[PDB]
Amino acid sequence: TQELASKRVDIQNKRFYLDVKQNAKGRFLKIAEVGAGGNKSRLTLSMSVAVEFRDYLGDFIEHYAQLGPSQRALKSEFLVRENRKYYMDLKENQRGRFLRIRQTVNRGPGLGSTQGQTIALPAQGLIEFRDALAKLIDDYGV
Structure with a gap:
């Protein structure tokens, strides 16, 4: 498994990596939320699914931009493709608005396990995160 590219997105004091990888089955995106000394969690998306994710991010962006003061x-929202489900929830708590993304398996073993498969983006960073994603999709296609 080779790494084609890796972008880091820094959002307040969180860091995220979007990496484009290749194997025999084809091209894929790995998205990690980094912890203190390792990756906290990671999502795995095909490049095709990444396009749809990019578009959903657009809708989240628009939503966030219009909310006004809390x-x-x-x-x-959720997206299913390829036996993979992605839940996308825009939420707020005391510290601010955020976009939680959880990946699971649709069916088969795992059947609703989510562990080290949840990331949480501060909402401030959604545009930069979408742009990084979009750059990687422009770079590497599918």
């Missing part, structure tokens, strides 16, 4: 998710 005074149960603000917005919840």
